[PDB]
Amino acid sequence: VSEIQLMHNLGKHLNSMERVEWLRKKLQDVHNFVAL
Numbered sequence: 001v002s003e004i005q006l007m008h009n010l011g012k013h014l015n016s017m018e019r020v021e022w023l024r025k026k027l028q029d030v031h032n033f034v035a036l
């Protein structure tokens with residue numbers, strides 16, 4: 001529940017080392033602000 005098509009597409013849904021790419025692209029979503 002809540003992990004709909006658009007929600008699951010957010011950072012392709014991750015776990016930990018994958019899950020960080022989500023937190024990196026989220027900072028780069030605010031302004032195409034490339035993270036690391």
